[PDB]
């Protein structure tokens, strides 16, 4: 029916109005203090007054750190920009890791813009260019103007076009009888399709037949847009959208990541602050989540130390599963969670605790409910003891082969024999390691 | 196309109850591994869950990549199977995480349903109007059947397809409207006063009858990576073949995720999950493993099969040793299938299947000698000796590999252990680790 | 292996013939193009498609040039003036190719040996187009 992949049984933190976590709510089992801390962090993000507040999710493997970050993202909603990331994703071969970290920092700060658009739209009735007196003078275009006749529902208009507007008119292949859409903000022209007032069944192009647009030809419409600061930075850095030569050649060159300067970011911040000051823009800070934070080297850690003190930085959530591991790129420093102490001093560490047998059992039960598999109580208890014996994830990922083995025997429930056969067919890390030690040829 | 190492395998050889036959579909033995691979195959074909990591671990020359090829052959058509090596991630134009994301999204197919129209008829009149520089092209096409007659309107692409494989007003053509493809089915009118320019030897077909325009519904599968590359820039279709797609931004990927979800909601397209096979997965950095640990938890993730032959070896990028060369975070969320070594009988019938695949007729004593030398040495050496002994047998003009052809192939071509013994008995003649050699014989 | 029907030789005549009923608003509505190709031990006039005249005037074929016509594609391609027209100008650029041998119309069985990497290179970069 649907698709579930190691998640999507979690719909939120599962809190009340007092911030107190229940036991089994929102698909979460246990971790009361960690969920309450994440709820306090969610309230801090929803306050929209902070900058650079960074927390760290600490705990062992398979304890619910990425689950807690995804629950934070689900609790904040789709309007808050959420940027999930992996520590190895910052190493790019096109641009330095400093620029990639700053780009992901700007990608997590979004804003709602109420943008007005000046629109000329209608059906093209006439298209008559006016030639120049000397087309081969070297400078100046071939034509002088182009008269465009636009007809909409209850109104008609004629427009004397600039040649640069006619370039965007011609590039979308506008002919007589086409419904068009001229945007006066950028000069962009969208050809909506052939008009339906004429014949329809005599084409050979699978074109779209569009009725007459209602209202006047010349319009002003307010459109609510949702952009991030990184979108504005890459729009200004690689300028496409104008009708000039650089904008046309910007769309055709290969897009490459460049080092966005501090001057461009400050100018973008100034224009966005002006847009907020007129009241047409509202700033929405978001979350940058960097999972497996132990894989950053000391350069990205030091630039993170610098960039957390910026006045525009988002709320950063980090996760690691290392106890006392040397920081990458260094040789001697032993640091907790693979994070240097200068970054640790600016952090707020949230500890994630392991689970008991009963918590593992109800996690298996809820994941079997979400995967739409029926399990009996004896097989569920065997899977719980099996999960406590090896790991939680190996019992989690043996549910689908158990369902397959139950389906091959033309049964719907999962029994003890299905779990035994899935145990015999598929091995965990420990049993495969025990195979690895007791072999002559390297296995 | 040619006879490869796994060309004898067409499927897994499993029945309706997922029980492996002892010798079926080119796969022999390995009943636990083959039953486990059938469970993987049924779970992929079910397509309900996503992002499950499968590990195929075992010794060399055992049938790990053979099992993966059997899974891919039992997968069938229109399901994306991506088979990559471990060394293909390291690129000078892509990062490791971007290469892994592209390898992940090459294994998720989007089966898009399309509504097209087929126009097949005899061409009556072609009017093509072009500008003086030949830029703006438009015109009308008059095409008829034995019953109907319609005048259509042409565009630039339609005229471009018309002037290629050129139709001369009396050739029966077929036009796919959605794909824009013209297939000239043949010539019907057979004009007497032909121009003596082209090689007018066109096939004679009749004028088609009935409906000129017939609606049709077609289905094609496009992977997510192709949609990403197409929407990435204005020349993405050429970058689909040159591979010049340098680090596609994440905004394209999330917008295309939203668009694919909208297409699934509309019923226009459906998602076909596939298998990403990473052969020799121990040749990956820990950065790749740490990216894979989070890439498996996404909804748009395929069922990843990894194969490795290493024991407790050093993980790449670090200074410690791990089982199968993989860290315990990846091994926690992986499901391990263990493959076991072969006995004499399984080796004998594997060699028999490889001999009948290569169209090589072995005698029983030659097969026994090949089984003995595949027990003493490895299986792959005795498999490779088959074609060499076949060429030796055809050199002496008999179409049957006898015992002495296998003896001559054993004498001429060495195994690993004999070459190791010859090197260690003659260490002065070879360049060692210290770069010392004795070229002179006196 | 390939089979090619090839017309080649020195152009002896080039007469774009008009139609019996020309249409108004245009000039020289061509009904067919008559070319005259001469070669070694033989000559032959041709009755070509009307659309080949735009290729002739685009490729600048004149009287006395040696051209190369293949059958199913049209696609005129001059190689140069004949060597019989080399001593009428003291200064000129274009080389004077000799008068081609054999008949004007011939079928030559060519054999092309290309590797698979040549096909991958020729298919990776596109055909020679008209984009920047």
């Amino acid at each position: 029916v649907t698709r579930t992949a190691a998640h999507t049984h979690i719909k939120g933190l599962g809190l009340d109005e007092s911030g107190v976590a229940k036991r089994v709510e929102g698909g979460f089992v246990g971790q009361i203090e960690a969920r309450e801390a994440c709820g306090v962090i969610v309230d801090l993000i929803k306050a929209k007054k902070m900058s650079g507040r960074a927390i760290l999710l600490a705990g062992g493997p398979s304890t619910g750190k990425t689950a807690l970050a995804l629950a934070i993202s689900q609790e904040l909603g789709p309007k808050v920009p959420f940027c999930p990331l992996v520590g190895s994703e910052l190493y790019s071969v096109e641009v330095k890791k400093t620029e990639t970290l700053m780009e992901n920092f700007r990608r997590a700060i979004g804003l709602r813009i109420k943008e007005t658009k000046e629109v000329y739209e209608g059906e093209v009735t006439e298209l008559t260019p006016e030639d120049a007196e000397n087309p081969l003078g070297g400078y100046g275009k071939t034509i002088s103007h182009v008269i465009v006749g636009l007809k909409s529902a209850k109104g008609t208009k004629t427009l004397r076009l600039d040649p640069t507007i006619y370039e965007s008119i011609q590039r979308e292949k506008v002919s007589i009888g086409d419904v068009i859409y001229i945007e006066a903000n950028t000069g962009a022209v969208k050809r909506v399709g052939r008009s339906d007032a004429y014949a329809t069944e005599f084409d050979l192009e699978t074109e779209e037949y569009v009725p007459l647009p209602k209202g006047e030809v010349h319009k002003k419409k307010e459109i609510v847009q949702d952009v991030t600061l990184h979108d504005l930075d890459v729009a200004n850095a690689r300028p496409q959208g104008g009708q000039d030569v650089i904008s046309m050649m910007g769309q055709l060159l290969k897009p490459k990541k460049t080092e966005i300067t501090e001057k461009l970011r400050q100018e973008v911040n100034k224009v966005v602050a002006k847009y907020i000051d007129q009241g047409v823009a509202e700033l929405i800070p978001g979350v940058l989540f960097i999972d497996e934070v132990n894989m950053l080297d000391i350069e990205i850690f030091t630039y993170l130390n610098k960039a957390l003190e910026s006045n525009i930085a988002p709320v950063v959530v980090l996760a690691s599963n290392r106890g006392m591991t040397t920081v990458r790129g260094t040789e001697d420093v032993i640091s907790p969670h693979g994070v240097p102490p200068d970054l640790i001093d600016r952090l707020l560490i949230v500890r994630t605790l392991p689970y008991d047998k009963d918590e593992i059992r109800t996690i298996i039960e809820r994941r079997a409910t979400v995967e739409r598999l029926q399990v009996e109580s004896s097989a569920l208890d065997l899977l719980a003891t099996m999960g406590t014996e090896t790991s939680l994830r190996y019992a989690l990922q043996l549910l689908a082969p158990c369902g397959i083995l139950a389906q091959t025997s033309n049964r719907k429930e999962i029994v003890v024999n299905d779990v035994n056969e899935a145990k015999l067919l598929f091995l965990d890390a420990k049993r495969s390691t025990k195979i690895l030690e007791t072999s002559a040829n390297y296995l | 196309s040619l006879i490869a190492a796994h060309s004898h395998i067409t499927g897994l050889g499993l029945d309706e109850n997922l029980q492996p036959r002892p010798t079926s579909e080119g796969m022999v033995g390995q009943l636990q591994a083959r039953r486990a691979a059938g469970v993987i195959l049924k779970m992929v074909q079910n397509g309900t869950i996503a992002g499950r990591a499968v590990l195929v671990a075992g010794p060399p020359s055992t049938g790990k990549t053979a099992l993966a090829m059997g899974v891919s052959q039992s997968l069938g058509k229109d399901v994306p199977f991506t088979a990559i090596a471990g060394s293909e991630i390291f690129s000078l134009e892509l990062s490791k995480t971007e290469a892994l994301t592209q390898a992940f999204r090459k294994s998720i197919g989007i089966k898009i349903k399309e509504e097209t129209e087929l126009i097949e008829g005899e061409v009556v009149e072609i009017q093509i109007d072009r500008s003086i520089t030949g830029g703006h092209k438009q015109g009308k096409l008059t095409i008829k059947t034995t019953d109907m007659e319609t005048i259509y309107e042409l565009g630039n692409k339609m005229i471009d397809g018309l002037t290629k494989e050129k139709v001369l007003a009396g050739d029966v053509i077929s036009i796919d409207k959605a794909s824009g493809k013209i297939t000239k089915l043949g010539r019907s009118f057979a004009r007497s006063r032909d121009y003596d320019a082209m090689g007018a030897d066109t096939r004679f077909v009749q004028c088609p009858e009935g409906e000129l325009q017939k609606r049709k519904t077609v289905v094609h599968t496009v992977s997510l990576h192709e949609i990403d590359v197409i929407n990435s820039r204005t020349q993405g279709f050429l970058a689909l073949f040159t591979g010049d797609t340098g680090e596609i931004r994440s905004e394209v990927r999330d917008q295309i995720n939203t668009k694919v979800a909208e297409w699934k909601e509309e019923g226009k397209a459906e998602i076909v999950p596939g298998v990403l096979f990473i052969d020799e997965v121990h040749m990956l950095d820990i950065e790749c493993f740490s990216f894979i640990n989070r890439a498996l938890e996404d909804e748009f993730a395929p069922i990843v099969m990894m194969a490795t032959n290493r024991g407790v070896s050093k993980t790449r990028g670090t200074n410690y040793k791990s089982p199968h060369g993989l860290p315990l975070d990846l091994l926690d969320r992986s499901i391990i299938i263990t493959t076991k070594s072969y006995n004499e009988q399984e080796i004998k019938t594997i060699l028999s299947i490889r001999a009948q695949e290569e169209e090589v007729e072995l005698s029983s004593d030659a097969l026994d000698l090949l089984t003995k030398t595949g027990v003493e040495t490895s299986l792959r050496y005795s498999s490779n000796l088959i074609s060499v002994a076949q060429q030796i047998a055809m050199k002496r003009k008999n179409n049957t590999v006898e015992v002495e052809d296998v003896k001559r192939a054993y004498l001429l071509f060495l195994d690993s252990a004999r070459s190791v013994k010859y090197v260690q008995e003659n260490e002065s003649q070879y360049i060692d680790d210290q770069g010392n050699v004795q070229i002179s014989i006196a | 292996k390939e089979t090619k029907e090839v017309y080649e030789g020195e152009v002896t005549e080039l007469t774009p013939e008009d139609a019996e009923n020309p249409l108004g608003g245009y000039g020289k509505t061509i009904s067919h193009v008559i070319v005259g190709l001469k070669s070694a031990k033989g000559t032959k006039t041709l009755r070509l498609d009307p659309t080949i005249y735009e290729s002739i005037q685009r490729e600048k074929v004149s009287i006395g040039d040696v051209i190369y016509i293949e059958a199913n594609t049209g696609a005129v391609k001059r190689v140069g003036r004949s060597d019989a027209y080399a001593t009428e100008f003291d200064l000129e650029t274009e080389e004077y190719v000799p008068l081609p041998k054999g008949e004007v119309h011939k079928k030559k069985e060519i054999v092309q040996d290309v590797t698979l990497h040549d096909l991958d290179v020729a298919n990776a970069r596109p055909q020679g187009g008209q984009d920047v």
């Binding site: - | 009149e125 | 139609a19 735009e54």
Partner: peptide
């Protein structure tokens, strides 16, 4: 009712006709 055809405008454009018996090329 019946919709009319789209207005066909070919002004100052070279004309190519392919009929059953003969072809045209109306150039300028």
């Amino acid at each position: 009712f019946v919709k009319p055809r789209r207005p066909y405008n070919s002004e100052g454009m070279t004309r190519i006709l392919r009929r059953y018996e003969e072809d045209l090329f109306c150039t300028f």
